[PDB]
Amino acid sequence: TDSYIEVLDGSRVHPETYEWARKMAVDALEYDNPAGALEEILENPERLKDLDLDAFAEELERQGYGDKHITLYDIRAELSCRYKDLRTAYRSPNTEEIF
């Protein structure tokens, strides 16, 4: 209608971590626009592999959010191929299955 749609809605990343995801995208591009940086990282995910997430997790722990190593790594893996079907690939029934 007349509102901007947050691109991360299509991804995982609970809405309580949109600010963290935006900051991670802005820092990976090594900028000094949140949405533009997010849209660029979504298409150039190779730049997220060089970012240090352990330092960010330590920063979060020192700020007062508790342990977030796994949460941040999950957000990074999400930026890389938003919602990737974790289900096992299709396989043809083997001999015993067919029998």
């Binding site: 991670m24 820092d27 060089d50 970012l51 240090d52 330092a55 920063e59």
Partner: peptide, 23 residues
């Protein structure tokens, strides 16, 4: 000069060379 907010830094060369052997 000092109003710069925290910035998520990049990994060191040691980490970039070591962690690359894990997947």
């Amino acid at each position: 000069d000092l109003k710069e907010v925290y910035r998520i830094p990049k990994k060191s060369q040691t980490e970039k060379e070591n962690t690359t052997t894990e997947r």
